[PDB]
UniProtKB/Swiss-Prot annotation, chain A:
Recorded consequence of changing V23E: Abolishes binding to CHMP6
Subunit and partners: Component of a complex at least composed of ELL, SNF8/EAP30, VPS25/EAP20 and VPS36/EAP45. Component of the endosomal sorting complex required for transport II (ESCRT-II), composed of SNF8, VPS36 and 2 copies of VPS25. Interacts with CFTR; the interaction requires misfolded CFTR. Interacts (via C-terminal half) with the ESCRT-III subunit CHMP6 (via N-terminal half).
Function, as annotated: Component of the ESCRT-II complex (endosomal sorting complex required for transport II), which is required for multivesicular body (MVB) formation and sorting of endosomal cargo proteins into MVBs. The MVB pathway mediates delivery of transmembrane proteins into the lumen of the lysosome for degradation. The ESCRT-II complex is probably involved in the recruitment of the ESCRT-III complex. The ESCRT-II complex may also play a role in transcription regulation, possibly via its interaction with ELL. The ESCRT-II complex may be involved in facilitating the budding of certain RNA viruses.
Subcellular location: Cytoplasm; Endosome membrane; Nucleus, Nucleoplasm
Protein's organism: Homo sapiens
Top-level taxonomic group: Eukaryota
Protein name per the record: Vacuolar protein-sorting-associated protein 25
Tissue spec. comment: Expressed at the mRNA level in kidney, liver, pancreas, and placenta. Lower levels of expression are found in heart, skeletal muscle, brain and lung.
Family, as annotated: Belongs to the VPS25 family.
Swiss-Prot record, chain B:
Summary of subunit composition and partner proteins: Probable core component of the endosomal sorting required for transport complex III (ESCRT-III). ESCRT-III components are thought to multimerize to form a flat lattice on the perimeter membrane of the endosome. Several assembly forms of ESCRT-III may exist that interact and act sequentially. Interacts with VPS4A; the interaction is direct. Interacts with VPS4B; the interaction is direct. Interacts with CHMP4A, CHMP4B and CHMP4C. Interacts with SNF8, VPS25 and VPS36.
PTM info: ISGylated in a CHMP5-dependent manner. Isgylation weakens its interaction with VPS4A.
Similarity comment text for this entry: Belongs to the SNF7 family.
Disulphide linkage map: none
Tissue: Ubiquitously expressed.
Transmembrane annotation, as ranges: none
Gene (name only): CHMP6
Subcellular location: Endomembrane system; Endosome membrane; Late endosome membrane; Membrane
Protein purpose: Probable core component of the endosomal sorting required for transport complex III (ESCRT-III) which is involved in multivesicular bodies (MVBs) formation and sorting of endosomal cargo proteins into MVBs. MVBs contain intraluminal vesicles (ILVs) that are generated by invagination and scission from the limiting membrane of the endosome and mostly are delivered to lysosomes enabling degradation of membrane proteins, such as stimulated growth factor receptors, lysosomal enzymes and lipids. The MVB pathway appears to require the sequential function of ESCRT-O, -I,-II and -III complexes.
This protein's name: Charged multivesicular body protein 6
The record's note on its domains: The acidic C-terminus and the basic N-termminus are thought to render the protein in a closed, soluble and inactive conformation through an autoinhibitory intramolecular interaction. The open and active conformation, which enables membrane binding and oligomerization, is achieved by interaction with other cellular binding partners, probably including other ESCRT components.
Length: 75, 35
């Protein structure tokens, strides 16, 4: 695997099915209920952020890093 | 420029407070059966 590959998998999941939300905490992507059966559940924050950074570079995501509400929006 | 709204960030502040409580809830669930 690679962070960009993890990126490909996460973005696939946001689009295919779980399409109500555009805004996700980093925690719920890896430890939430809706993603429990996905290949990226349990993925560490560090690698998740690098996955999301590759997505952000392709304009598919914008990361929110403020401590009062960390997470990511997908486009 | 940013494509994230004040509304988007407001969801996230609440979803974060939810998340941290969920982490403690899971820890309790685990302990309830531990004994």
């Amino acid at each position: 695997r690679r962070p960009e590959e993890w990126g490909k998998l996460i973005y696939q999941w946001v689009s295919r099915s779980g399409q109500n939300n555009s805004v996700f905490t980093l925690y719920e992507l890896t430890n939430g209920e809706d993603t429990e059966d996905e290949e990226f559940h349990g993925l560490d924050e560090a690698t998740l952020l690098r996955a999301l950074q590759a997505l952000q570079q392709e304009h598919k995501a914008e990361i929110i890093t403020v401590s009062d509400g960390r997470g990511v929006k997908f486009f | 420029g940013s494509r994230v709204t004040e509304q988007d960030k407001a969801i996230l502040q609440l979803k974060q407070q939810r998340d941290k409580l969920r982490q403690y809830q899971k820890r309790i669930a685990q302990q309830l059966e531990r004994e």
